[PDB]
């Protein structure tokens, strides 16, 4: 009943906080689970 849930969302003016893995796939986002559960940075020389 996707459209019914849609209705309930718009009528709420809902905002997706884009946490759901399914939703995250729908929006083309790195999945938050597992290897996407975290971030990677790099140490770079400042001089």
């Amino acid at each position: 009943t996707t459209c019914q849930f849609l209705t309930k969302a718009v009528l709420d003016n809902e905002r997706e906080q884009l946490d759901s893995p399914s939703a995250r796939i729908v929006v083309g986002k790195l999945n938050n689970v597992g290897t996407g559960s975290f971030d990677v940075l790099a140490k770079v020389p400042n001089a």
Binding site: L30, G34, T35
Partner: protein, 344 residues
């Protein structure tokens, strides 16, 4: 290469299936030995296939129609042949100056299947051949029929002969619904050879029988072997025998009169080393049939292809160069693995 089973019901004759034999009597060793004979994989003699074993052919028919657009002769304009000269004269390498291929012609996907000329385009155009493999043109049939005049012969049916060699992955089955693909075409030298001087056509692993309870296959082996040695067909009608007249005794004794193991095994030597194998191997003659499902032919690969415009996602089908679906279950399963960089 069709044969009549040695072992048959008498209704095989009474219903005449001998008119249309669908398989052949093969030398089978019931042996796990090669290590490619497990579960559903069976080995064929390579030299045996080279001798033509299970060779089969597949015919594909084509209808080339040009009356689909018909609508008041008027502008009808296509005639098989040429007009602009500008066509690659190498098209004659396959198609006669009338636009139809020379019956017998070798064709590969992309080659022209016919040549025609439409005045609107002032061009000699061709309908390309689209297949995964080459074929040969078997028949070219000219259809003017049901037509009012149509004398220009705008509809032609062309039959292609595509050869089907026994190959790894093609499915094969005995008369017992115990189907398996040929895992590999074992060199004849590497096969095991009996002290009779033969090496089997097909090897089926014994561990397949204990779950399937295909013991009809055991008796078919011992009866087809007896019937080849004495040289007569054996009756396989259900309940011609009885608990007090087992077939293993009937054909067993017949075989022993023949000069062969009553239990039907024969001492074979390893092709590779040469020692005598631990035990006498169960060998016999079994009617094996090649299933049309060469799912071997079902292989497909796509690293690039068309996409649907409403998604720009891989299109569908092997023949369409379509792309397999990673469904919901595969998506979820990849999330299970944590492979989120693989899932994206």
């Amino acid at each position: 290469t069709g044969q009549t089973p040695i072992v048959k019901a008498n209704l095989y004759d009474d219903y005449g299936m001998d008119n249309f034999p669908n398989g052949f009597n093969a030398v089978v060793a019931v042996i796990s030995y090669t290590g490619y004979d497990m579960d559903d994989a069976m080995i064929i003699n390579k030299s045996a296939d080279e001798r033509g074993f299970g060779y089969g052919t597949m015919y594909k028919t084509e209808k080339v129609d040009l009356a689909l657009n018909r609508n008041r002769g008027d502008p009808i304009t296509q005639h098989f042949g040429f007009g602009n000269d500008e066509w690659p004269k190498e098209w004659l390498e396959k198609l006669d100056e009338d636009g139809l291929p020379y019956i017998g012609t070798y064709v590969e996907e992309g080659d022209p299947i016919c040549a025609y000329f439409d005045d609107t385009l002032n061009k000699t155009k061709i309908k390309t051949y689209h297949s995964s493999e080459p074929a040969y043109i078997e028949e070219v049939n000219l259809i003017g029929d049901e037509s009012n005049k149509f004398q220009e012969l705008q509809t032609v049916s062309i039959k292609y002969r595509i050869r089907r060699t026994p190959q790894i992955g093609d499915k094969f089955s005995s008369r017992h619904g115990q189907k398996g693909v040929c895992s590999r075409k074992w060199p004849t030298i590497d096969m095991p050879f009996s002290e009779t001087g033969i090496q089997p056509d097909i090897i089926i692993n014994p561990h397949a029988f204990p779950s399937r309870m295909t013991i009809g296959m055991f008796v078919e082996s011992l009866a087809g072997k007896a019937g080849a040695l004495h040289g007569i067909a054996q009756d396989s009608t259900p309940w011609i025998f009885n608990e007090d007249d087992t077939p293993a005794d009937y054909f067993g004794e017949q075989l022993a009169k023949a000069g062969y193991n009553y239990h039907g095994n024969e001492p074979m030597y390893s092709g590779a080393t040469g020692e005598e194998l631990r035990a006498d191997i169960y060998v016999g003659v079994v009617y094996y049939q090649r299933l049309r499902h060469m799912v071997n032919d079902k292989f497909q690969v796509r690293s690039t292809g068309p996409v649907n415009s409403l998604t720009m996602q891989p299109v569908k089908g092997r023949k369409r160069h379509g792309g397999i679906r990673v469904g919901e279950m595969e998506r979820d399963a990849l999330i299970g693995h944590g492979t989120s960089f693989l899932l994206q």
